[PDB]
Symmetry: D2
Subunit: 116 residues, 4 copies
Amino acid sequence: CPLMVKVLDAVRGSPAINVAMHVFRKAADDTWEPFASGKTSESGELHGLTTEEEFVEGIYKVEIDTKSYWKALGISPFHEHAEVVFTANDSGPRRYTIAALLSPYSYSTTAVVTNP
Amino acid sequence: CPLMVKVLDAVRGSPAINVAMHVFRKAADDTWEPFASGKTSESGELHGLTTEEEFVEGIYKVEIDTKSYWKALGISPFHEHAEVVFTANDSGPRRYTIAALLSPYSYSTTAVVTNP
Amino acid sequence: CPLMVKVLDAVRGSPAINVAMHVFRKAADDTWEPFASGKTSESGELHGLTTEEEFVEGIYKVEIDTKSYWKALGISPFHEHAEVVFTANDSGPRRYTIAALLSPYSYSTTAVVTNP
Amino acid sequence: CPLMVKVLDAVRGSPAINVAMHVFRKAADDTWEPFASGKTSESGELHGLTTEEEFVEGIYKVEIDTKSYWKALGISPFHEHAEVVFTANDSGPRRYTIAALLSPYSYSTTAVVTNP
Ligand SMILES: Cc1ccc(C(=O)c2cc(O)c(O)c([N+](=O)[O-])c2)cc1
Ligand SMILES: Cc1ccc(C(=O)c2cc(O)c(O)c([N+](=O)[O-])c2)cc1
Protein backbone atom coordinates (compact mmCIF):
# COMPACT_ATOMS: atom_id res chain seq x y z
CA CYS A 1 0.00 0.00 0.00
CA PRO A 2 2.01 2.99 -1.26
CA LEU A 3 -0.80 5.43 -0.32
CA MET A 4 -3.30 5.29 2.55
CA VAL A 5 -5.64 7.99 3.85
CA LYS A 6 -6.99 8.13 7.41
CA VAL A 7 -9.73 10.52 8.55
CA LEU A 8 -10.70 11.30 12.15
CA ASP A 9 -13.64 13.18 13.69
CA ALA A 10 -12.66 15.70 16.40
CA VAL A 11 -16.29 16.32 17.45
CA ARG A 12 -17.21 12.73 18.24
CA GLY A 13 -13.70 11.41 18.92
CA SER A 14 -13.98 8.61 16.43
CA PRO A 15 -12.82 7.46 13.02
CA ALA A 16 -14.65 9.37 10.29
CA ILE A 17 -16.48 6.51 8.56
CA ASN A 18 -17.81 6.48 4.98
CA VAL A 19 -15.95 9.65 4.02
CA ALA A 20 -15.67 9.80 0.24
CA MET A 21 -12.54 11.06 -1.48
CA HIS A 22 -11.05 11.28 -4.95
CA VAL A 23 -7.34 11.27 -5.79
CA PHE A 24 -6.15 13.26 -8.80
CA ARG A 25 -2.86 13.56 -10.57
CA LYS A 26 -1.70 16.72 -12.28
CA ALA A 27 -1.52 16.33 -16.05
CA ALA A 28 0.92 17.88 -18.51
CA ASP A 29 -1.48 20.72 -19.35
CA ASP A 30 -1.86 21.54 -15.62
CA THR A 31 -5.28 19.87 -15.31
CA TRP A 32 -6.39 17.41 -12.63
CA GLU A 33 -6.89 13.87 -13.89
CA PRO A 34 -8.81 11.28 -11.84
CA PHE A 35 -6.47 8.63 -10.44
CA ALA A 36 -8.23 6.73 -7.64
CA SER A 37 -11.08 7.08 -5.17
CA GLY A 38 -12.98 5.37 -2.40
CA LYS A 39 -14.50 5.79 1.03
CA THR A 40 -13.08 5.32 4.48
CA SER A 41 -13.86 2.10 6.32
CA GLU A 42 -15.16 1.69 9.86
CA SER A 43 -11.59 2.39 11.03
CA GLY A 44 -11.51 5.70 9.18
CA GLU A 45 -8.92 4.32 6.75
CA LEU A 46 -8.92 4.04 2.96
CA HIS A 47 -6.45 1.44 1.64
CA GLY A 48 -5.67 0.02 -1.77
CA LEU A 49 -5.96 3.31 -3.65
CA THR A 50 -3.00 2.51 -5.91
CA THR A 51 -0.08 0.16 -6.53
CA GLU A 52 3.66 0.76 -6.46
CA GLU A 53 3.95 0.47 -10.24
CA GLU A 54 1.16 2.98 -10.84
CA PHE A 55 2.15 5.52 -8.18
CA VAL A 56 4.86 7.38 -10.07
CA GLU A 57 6.39 10.75 -9.25
CA GLY A 58 4.00 13.61 -9.82
CA ILE A 59 1.73 16.09 -8.11
CA TYR A 60 -1.26 14.44 -6.49
CA LYS A 61 -4.41 15.92 -5.03
CA VAL A 62 -6.60 14.19 -2.45
CA GLU A 63 -10.04 15.83 -2.34
CA ILE A 64 -11.87 14.70 0.81
CA ASP A 65 -15.64 15.38 0.79
CA THR A 66 -15.80 16.71 4.32
CA LYS A 67 -18.97 18.69 3.65
CA SER A 68 -21.06 15.58 2.93
CA TYR A 69 -19.68 13.97 6.10
CA TRP A 70 -20.82 16.83 8.34
CA LYS A 71 -24.13 17.18 6.50
CA ALA A 72 -24.90 13.52 7.21
CA LEU A 73 -24.31 14.20 10.93
CA GLY A 74 -26.56 17.27 10.88
CA ILE A 75 -23.69 19.71 11.50
CA SER A 76 -23.10 22.88 9.50
CA PRO A 77 -19.52 22.91 8.15
CA PHE A 78 -17.29 25.68 6.88
CA HIS A 79 -15.28 23.97 4.15
CA GLU A 80 -16.57 22.60 0.86
CA HIS A 81 -13.94 19.85 1.17
CA ALA A 82 -10.35 19.32 2.31
CA GLU A 83 -7.75 19.29 -0.48
CA VAL A 84 -4.32 17.77 0.19
CA VAL A 85 -1.91 18.56 -2.67
CA PHE A 86 1.60 17.12 -2.62
CA THR A 87 4.49 15.96 -4.78
CA ALA A 88 5.25 12.25 -4.57
CA ASN A 89 9.03 11.78 -4.54
CA ASP A 90 10.86 8.58 -5.54
CA SER A 91 14.35 9.67 -4.52
CA GLY A 92 13.99 7.11 -1.73
CA PRO A 93 11.60 4.31 -0.78
CA ARG A 94 8.47 6.00 0.54
CA ARG A 95 5.06 4.83 1.74
CA TYR A 96 2.57 7.64 2.39
CA THR A 97 -0.09 7.96 5.05
CA ILE A 98 -2.23 11.08 4.73
CA ALA A 99 -4.19 11.77 7.89
CA ALA A 100 -6.93 14.37 8.23
CA LEU A 101 -8.46 15.52 11.51
CA LEU A 102 -11.88 17.10 10.93
CA SER A 103 -13.85 19.72 12.85
CA PRO A 104 -16.78 21.68 11.40
CA TYR A 105 -14.79 24.91 11.09
CA SER A 106 -11.27 23.54 11.03
CA TYR A 107 -9.23 20.69 9.68
CA SER A 108 -5.65 19.56 9.93
CA THR A 109 -3.72 17.24 7.70
CA THR A 110 -0.34 15.60 8.12
CA ALA A 111 1.80 13.21 6.12
CA VAL A 112 3.55 10.24 7.67
CA VAL A 113 6.17 9.25 5.10
CA THR A 114 8.04 6.05 5.90
CA ASN A 115 10.71 3.91 4.25
CA PRO A 116 9.88 0.16 3.93
CA CYS B 1 -12.29 44.02 5.94
CA PRO B 2 -14.64 41.10 5.24
CA LEU B 3 -11.79 38.66 4.50
CA MET B 4 -8.49 38.40 6.35
CA VAL B 5 -5.94 35.58 6.29
CA LYS B 6 -3.41 34.91 9.06
CA VAL B 7 -0.51 32.46 8.67
CA LEU B 8 1.67 31.12 11.49
CA ASP B 9 4.92 29.11 11.54
CA ALA B 10 4.80 26.22 14.03
CA VAL B 11 8.54 25.47 13.67
CA ARG B 12 9.83 28.92 14.55
CA GLY B 13 6.88 30.05 16.70
CA SER B 14 6.40 33.18 14.66
CA PRO B 15 4.09 34.75 12.11
CA ALA B 16 4.70 33.41 8.63
CA ILE B 17 5.89 36.57 6.87
CA ASN B 18 5.76 37.28 3.11
CA VAL B 19 3.60 34.24 2.34
CA ALA B 20 1.91 34.64 -1.03
CA MET B 21 -1.69 33.59 -1.57
CA HIS B 22 -4.25 33.78 -4.35
CA VAL B 23 -8.03 33.92 -3.87
CA PHE B 24 -10.36 32.49 -6.50
CA ARG B 25 -14.14 32.57 -6.92
CA LYS B 26 -16.12 29.86 -8.65
CA ALA B 27 -17.74 31.21 -11.80
CA ALA B 28 -21.09 30.21 -13.26
CA ASP B 29 -19.34 27.80 -15.65
CA ASP B 30 -17.68 26.07 -12.65
CA THR B 31 -14.21 27.47 -13.41
CA TRP B 32 -12.05 29.22 -10.82
CA GLU B 33 -11.75 32.93 -11.59
CA PRO B 34 -9.06 35.13 -9.99
CA PHE B 35 -10.54 37.22 -7.19
CA ALA B 36 -7.69 38.74 -5.14
CA SER B 37 -4.13 38.07 -4.04
CA GLY B 38 -1.40 39.35 -1.77
CA LYS B 39 1.31 38.53 0.76
CA THR B 40 1.27 38.32 4.54
CA SER B 41 2.75 41.22 6.49
CA GLU B 42 5.31 41.13 9.31
CA SER B 43 2.42 40.11 11.58
CA GLY B 44 1.55 37.15 9.32
CA GLU B 45 -1.72 38.83 8.31
CA LEU B 46 -3.07 39.75 4.90
CA HIS B 47 -5.73 42.47 5.05
CA GLY B 48 -7.54 44.37 2.33
CA LEU B 49 -8.06 41.49 -0.10
CA THR B 50 -11.60 42.64 -0.88
CA THR B 51 -14.50 44.92 -0.01
CA GLU B 52 -18.04 44.27 1.17
CA GLU B 53 -19.46 45.23 -2.25
CA GLU B 54 -17.09 42.92 -4.16
CA PHE B 55 -17.31 39.95 -1.73
CA VAL B 56 -20.63 38.57 -2.97
CA GLU B 57 -22.13 35.13 -2.32
CA GLY B 58 -20.12 32.34 -3.83
CA ILE B 59 -17.62 29.55 -3.44
CA TYR B 60 -14.14 30.90 -2.73
CA LYS B 61 -10.74 29.22 -2.73
CA VAL B 62 -7.70 30.55 -0.90
CA GLU B 63 -4.48 28.96 -2.19
CA ILE B 64 -1.61 29.71 0.20
CA ASP B 65 1.85 29.17 -1.29
CA THR B 66 3.33 27.32 1.66
CA LYS B 67 5.86 25.46 -0.50
CA SER B 68 7.77 28.64 -1.45
CA TYR B 69 7.71 29.71 2.20
CA TRP B 70 9.41 26.52 3.44
CA LYS B 71 11.81 26.32 0.48
CA ALA B 72 13.14 29.82 1.21
CA LEU B 73 13.81 28.60 4.77
CA GLY B 74 15.73 25.59 3.42
CA ILE B 75 13.01 23.01 4.07
CA SER B 76 11.47 20.69 1.48
CA PRO B 77 7.83 20.51 2.62
CA PHE B 78 5.24 17.88 1.90
CA HIS B 79 2.42 20.05 0.56
CA GLU B 80 2.39 22.10 -2.60
CA HIS B 81 0.14 24.62 -0.84
CA ALA B 82 -2.62 24.92 1.73
CA GLU B 83 -6.03 25.32 0.09
CA VAL B 84 -9.16 26.57 1.86
CA VAL B 85 -12.44 26.24 -0.09
CA PHE B 86 -15.68 27.55 1.38
CA THR B 87 -19.07 29.03 0.60
CA ALA B 88 -19.24 32.66 1.71
CA ASN B 89 -22.08 35.06 2.51
CA ASP B 90 -24.96 32.77 1.59
CA SER B 91 -27.10 33.94 4.54
CA GLY B 92 -25.87 37.52 4.24
CA PRO B 93 -22.55 39.31 4.70
CA ARG B 94 -20.13 37.83 7.23
CA ARG B 95 -16.57 38.67 8.21
CA TYR B 96 -14.11 35.81 7.69
CA THR B 97 -10.73 35.24 9.28
CA ILE B 98 -8.89 32.27 7.78
CA ALA B 99 -5.96 31.13 9.89
CA ALA B 100 -3.36 28.62 8.73
CA LEU B 101 -0.78 26.98 11.02
CA LEU B 102 2.20 25.60 9.07
CA SER B 103 4.67 22.77 9.62
CA PRO B 104 6.79 21.12 6.92
CA TYR B 105 4.66 17.94 6.84
CA SER B 106 1.40 19.26 8.32
CA TYR B 107 -0.92 22.20 8.28
CA SER B 108 -4.14 23.14 9.97
CA THR B 109 -6.68 25.71 8.97
CA THR B 110 -9.54 27.25 10.89
CA ALA B 111 -12.16 29.87 10.17
CA VAL B 112 -13.56 32.50 12.50
CA VAL B 113 -16.83 33.80 11.07
CA THR B 114 -18.47 36.81 12.67
CA ASN B 115 -21.63 38.77 11.90
CA PRO B 116 -21.08 42.58 11.58
CA CYS C 1 1.52 42.81 27.40
CA PRO C 2 4.20 40.11 27.56
CA LEU C 3 1.68 37.25 27.80
CA MET C 4 -1.60 36.96 25.90
CA VAL C 5 -3.78 33.89 25.39
CA LYS C 6 -6.25 33.45 22.52
CA VAL C 7 -8.83 30.65 22.41
CA LEU C 8 -10.87 29.61 19.36
CA ASP C 9 -13.85 27.27 18.89
CA ALA C 10 -13.42 24.94 15.91
CA VAL C 11 -17.03 23.69 16.08
CA ARG C 12 -18.74 27.06 15.85
CA GLY C 13 -15.97 28.93 13.98
CA SER C 14 -15.84 31.65 16.58
CA PRO C 15 -13.71 32.98 19.40
CA ALA C 16 -14.12 30.94 22.57
CA ILE C 17 -15.66 33.54 24.88
CA ASN C 18 -15.57 33.55 28.71
CA VAL C 19 -13.05 30.70 28.91
CA ALA C 20 -11.39 30.66 32.32
CA MET C 21 -7.68 29.96 32.68
CA HIS C 22 -5.12 29.93 35.48
CA VAL C 23 -1.40 30.61 35.08
CA PHE C 24 1.12 28.99 37.42
CA ARG C 25 4.86 29.45 37.89
CA LYS C 26 7.17 26.72 39.10
CA ALA C 27 8.65 27.64 42.47
CA ALA C 28 12.12 26.79 43.75
CA ASP C 29 10.69 23.77 45.62
CA ASP C 30 9.22 22.46 42.33
CA THR C 31 5.62 23.26 43.30
CA TRP C 32 3.23 25.20 41.07
CA GLU C 33 2.50 28.63 42.52
CA PRO C 34 -0.44 30.76 41.33
CA PHE C 35 0.73 33.50 38.99
CA ALA C 36 -2.30 35.03 37.23
CA SER C 37 -5.77 34.15 35.99
CA GLY C 38 -8.66 35.51 33.97
CA LYS C 39 -11.27 34.85 31.30
CA THR C 40 -11.25 35.37 27.54
CA SER C 41 -13.10 38.39 26.16
CA GLU C 42 -15.65 38.52 23.35
CA SER C 43 -12.69 38.30 20.96
CA GLY C 44 -11.45 35.09 22.63
CA GLU C 45 -8.39 36.93 23.97
CA LEU C 46 -7.12 37.35 27.51
CA HIS C 47 -4.80 40.35 27.90
CA GLY C 48 -3.20 41.90 30.95
CA LEU C 49 -2.32 38.70 32.80
CA THR C 50 1.07 40.10 33.83
CA THR C 51 3.67 42.83 33.43
CA GLU C 52 7.24 42.85 32.19
CA GLU C 53 8.57 43.31 35.75
CA GLU C 54 6.53 40.41 37.17
CA PHE C 55 7.07 38.00 34.22
CA VAL C 56 10.54 36.81 35.22
CA GLU C 57 12.44 33.77 33.94
CA GLY C 58 10.79 30.52 34.88
CA ILE C 59 8.64 27.57 33.94
CA TYR C 60 5.02 28.62 33.46
CA LYS C 61 1.85 26.56 33.11
CA VAL C 62 -1.35 27.84 31.53
CA GLU C 63 -4.35 25.66 32.46
CA ILE C 64 -7.31 26.51 30.22
CA ASP C 65 -10.67 25.28 31.54
CA THR C 66 -11.95 23.86 28.28
CA LYS C 67 -14.21 21.34 30.02
CA SER C 68 -16.48 24.02 31.53
CA TYR C 69 -16.59 25.76 28.15
CA TRP C 70 -17.91 22.69 26.31
CA LYS C 71 -20.24 21.65 29.15
CA ALA C 72 -21.99 25.04 29.08
CA LEU C 73 -22.54 24.43 25.35
CA GLY C 74 -24.07 21.02 26.09
CA ILE C 75 -21.07 18.95 24.99
CA SER C 76 -19.24 16.39 27.11
CA PRO C 77 -15.61 16.86 26.00
CA PHE C 78 -12.72 14.47 26.24
CA HIS C 79 -10.17 16.67 28.00
CA GLU C 80 -10.34 18.08 31.49
CA HIS C 81 -8.43 21.14 30.26
CA ALA C 82 -5.76 22.24 27.82
CA GLU C 83 -2.40 22.73 29.55
CA VAL C 84 0.54 24.66 28.08
CA VAL C 85 3.85 24.36 29.98
CA PHE C 86 6.90 26.30 28.81
CA THR C 87 10.10 28.00 29.89
CA ALA C 88 9.82 31.77 29.49
CA ASN C 89 12.34 34.61 29.19
CA ASP C 90 15.49 32.55 29.69
CA SER C 91 17.43 34.49 27.05
CA GLY C 92 15.79 37.78 28.00
CA PRO C 93 12.27 39.21 27.84
CA ARG C 94 10.02 37.96 25.06
CA ARG C 95 6.37 38.53 24.21
CA TYR C 96 4.28 35.36 24.16
CA THR C 97 0.97 34.70 22.45
CA ILE C 98 -0.47 31.29 23.34
CA ALA C 99 -3.27 30.23 21.02
CA ALA C 100 -5.55 27.25 21.65
CA LEU C 101 -7.94 25.78 19.07
CA LEU C 102 -10.71 23.71 20.70
CA SER C 103 -12.82 20.76 19.58
CA PRO C 104 -14.71 18.39 21.91
CA TYR C 105 -12.20 15.53 21.41
CA SER C 106 -9.14 17.49 20.24
CA TYR C 107 -7.19 20.62 20.86
CA SER C 108 -4.13 22.24 19.42
CA THR C 109 -1.90 24.86 20.91
CA THR C 110 0.73 27.06 19.35
CA ALA C 111 3.03 29.80 20.58
CA VAL C 112 4.07 32.97 18.80
CA VAL C 113 7.18 34.36 20.49
CA THR C 114 8.44 37.79 19.50
CA ASN C 115 11.34 39.93 20.67
CA PRO C 116 10.35 43.52 21.69
CA CYS D 1 -5.36 -2.69 24.80
CA PRO D 2 -7.69 -0.25 26.58
CA LEU D 3 -5.21 2.64 26.15
CA MET D 4 -2.74 3.34 23.33
CA VAL D 5 -0.75 6.50 22.59
CA LYS D 6 0.53 7.46 19.14
CA VAL D 7 2.95 10.34 18.50
CA LEU D 8 3.77 11.89 15.12
CA ASP D 9 6.45 14.37 14.00
CA ALA D 10 5.15 17.22 11.80
CA VAL D 11 8.67 18.45 10.92
CA ARG D 12 10.00 15.21 9.48
CA GLY D 13 6.66 13.64 8.52
CA SER D 14 7.31 10.47 10.45
CA PRO D 15 6.33 8.57 13.57
CA ALA D 16 7.95 10.13 16.62
CA ILE D 17 10.13 7.24 17.81
CA ASN D 18 11.49 6.69 21.34
CA VAL D 19 9.28 9.38 22.85
CA ALA D 20 9.03 8.78 26.59
CA MET D 21 5.79 9.32 28.48
CA HIS D 22 4.32 8.69 31.92
CA VAL D 23 0.65 8.08 32.70
CA PHE D 24 -0.73 9.32 36.01
CA ARG D 25 -4.02 8.88 37.77
CA LYS D 26 -5.53 11.50 40.03
CA ALA D 27 -5.61 10.39 43.66
CA ALA D 28 -8.20 11.15 46.33
CA ASP D 29 -6.14 14.05 47.73
CA ASP D 30 -5.90 15.59 44.22
CA THR D 31 -2.32 14.43 43.64
CA TRP D 32 -0.95 12.67 40.55
CA GLU D 33 -0.02 9.04 41.13
CA PRO D 34 2.18 7.13 38.65
CA PHE D 35 0.15 4.53 36.76
CA ALA D 36 2.09 3.41 33.66
CA SER D 37 4.86 4.56 31.34
CA GLY D 38 6.92 3.65 28.32
CA LYS D 39 8.34 4.88 25.05
CA THR D 40 6.94 4.91 21.56
CA SER D 41 8.08 2.21 19.15
CA GLU D 42 9.38 2.63 15.61
CA SER D 43 5.74 3.10 14.55
CA GLY D 44 5.29 5.98 17.00
CA GLU D 45 2.90 3.86 19.09
CA LEU D 46 2.98 2.87 22.76
CA HIS D 47 0.86 -0.21 23.54
CA GLY D 48 0.29 -2.32 26.61
CA LEU D 49 0.21 0.56 29.08
CA THR D 50 -2.61 -0.99 31.11
CA THR D 51 -5.22 -3.76 31.25
CA GLU D 52 -9.01 -3.60 31.25
CA GLU D 53 -9.22 -4.63 34.90
CA GLU D 54 -6.74 -1.96 35.99
CA PHE D 55 -8.05 0.89 33.85
CA VAL D 56 -10.94 2.03 36.03
CA GLU D 57 -12.88 5.28 35.83
CA GLY D 58 -10.84 8.25 36.97
CA ILE D 59 -8.91 11.26 35.78
CA TYR D 60 -5.76 10.32 33.91
CA LYS D 61 -2.82 12.41 32.79
CA VAL D 62 -0.47 11.47 29.96
CA GLU D 63 2.74 13.51 30.20
CA ILE D 64 4.66 13.21 26.91
CA ASP D 65 8.32 14.32 27.10
CA THR D 66 8.28 16.30 23.88
CA LYS D 67 11.20 18.49 24.95
CA SER D 68 13.65 15.57 25.10
CA TYR D 69 12.44 14.43 21.66
CA TRP D 70 13.20 17.78 20.02
CA LYS D 71 16.47 18.17 21.93
CA ALA D 72 17.67 14.82 20.55
CA LEU D 73 16.96 16.12 17.02
CA GLY D 74 18.82 19.37 17.67
CA ILE D 75 15.67 21.52 17.49
CA SER D 76 14.74 24.16 20.05
CA PRO D 77 11.19 23.51 21.34
CA PHE D 78 8.66 25.70 23.08
CA HIS D 79 6.90 23.28 25.42
CA GLU D 80 8.38 21.49 28.40
CA HIS D 81 6.09 18.55 27.55
CA ALA D 82 2.59 17.82 26.29
CA GLU D 83 0.03 16.95 28.99
CA VAL D 84 -3.20 15.19 28.01
CA VAL D 85 -5.65 15.13 30.94
CA PHE D 86 -8.96 13.31 30.58
CA THR D 87 -11.67 11.43 32.45
CA ALA D 88 -11.98 7.76 31.53
CA ASN D 89 -15.68 6.86 31.38
CA ASP D 90 -17.10 3.33 31.73
CA SER D 91 -20.71 4.17 30.90
CA GLY D 92 -20.07 2.25 27.69
CA PRO D 93 -17.38 -0.03 26.25
CA ARG D 94 -14.49 2.24 25.31
CA ARG D 95 -10.98 1.74 23.94
CA TYR D 96 -8.85 4.90 23.87
CA THR D 97 -6.28 6.03 21.34
CA ILE D 98 -4.52 9.27 22.27
CA ALA D 99 -2.69 10.77 19.32
CA ALA D 100 -0.29 13.70 19.51
CA LEU D 101 1.06 15.62 16.52
CA LEU D 102 4.27 17.46 17.42
CA SER D 103 5.89 20.61 16.05
CA PRO D 104 8.58 22.60 17.88
CA TYR D 105 6.23 25.45 18.77
CA SER D 106 2.89 23.68 18.53
CA TYR D 107 1.23 20.41 19.29
CA SER D 108 -2.20 18.92 18.80
CA THR D 109 -3.82 16.01 20.53
CA THR D 110 -6.98 14.09 19.77
CA ALA D 111 -8.79 11.12 21.26
CA VAL D 112 -10.19 8.31 19.15
CA VAL D 113 -12.64 6.55 21.46
CA THR D 114 -14.12 3.35 20.06
CA ASN D 115 -16.50 0.64 21.24
CA PRO D 116 -15.23 -2.98 20.86
C1 LIG E 1 -3.80 16.08 11.29
C2 LIG E 1 -3.98 14.92 12.16
C3 LIG E 1 -3.59 14.97 13.50
C4 LIG E 1 -3.77 13.87 14.27
C5 LIG E 1 -4.33 12.71 13.73
C6 LIG E 1 -4.55 11.44 14.66
O1 LIG E 1 -5.00 11.59 15.68
C7 LIG E 1 -4.21 10.01 14.21
C8 LIG E 1 -4.89 8.95 14.79
C9 LIG E 1 -4.64 7.61 14.39
O2 LIG E 1 -5.37 6.52 15.00
C10 LIG E 1 -3.67 7.37 13.42
O3 LIG E 1 -3.39 6.01 13.02
C11 LIG E 1 -2.99 8.43 12.85
N1 LIG E 1 -1.95 8.20 11.81
O4 LIG E 1 -1.60 6.91 11.46
O5 LIG E 1 -1.35 9.29 11.22
C12 LIG E 1 -3.26 9.78 13.25
C13 LIG E 1 -4.73 12.68 12.42
C14 LIG E 1 -4.54 13.79 11.64
C1 LIG F 1 -5.28 26.36 12.35
C2 LIG F 1 -4.75 27.33 13.31
C3 LIG F 1 -4.66 27.03 14.68
C4 LIG F 1 -4.16 27.97 15.53
C5 LIG F 1 -3.76 29.21 15.03
C6 LIG F 1 -3.17 30.34 15.99
O1 LIG F 1 -2.29 30.09 16.67
C7 LIG F 1 -3.72 31.76 15.96
C8 LIG F 1 -2.96 32.77 16.54
C9 LIG F 1 -3.42 34.12 16.54
O2 LIG F 1 -2.61 35.15 17.14
C10 LIG F 1 -4.65 34.42 15.96
O3 LIG F 1 -5.14 35.79 15.96
C11 LIG F 1 -5.41 33.42 15.39
N1 LIG F 1 -6.72 33.77 14.78
O4 LIG F 1 -7.19 35.07 14.84
O5 LIG F 1 -7.47 32.80 14.16
C12 LIG F 1 -4.94 32.06 15.39
C13 LIG F 1 -3.85 29.48 13.69
C14 LIG F 1 -4.36 28.53 12.84
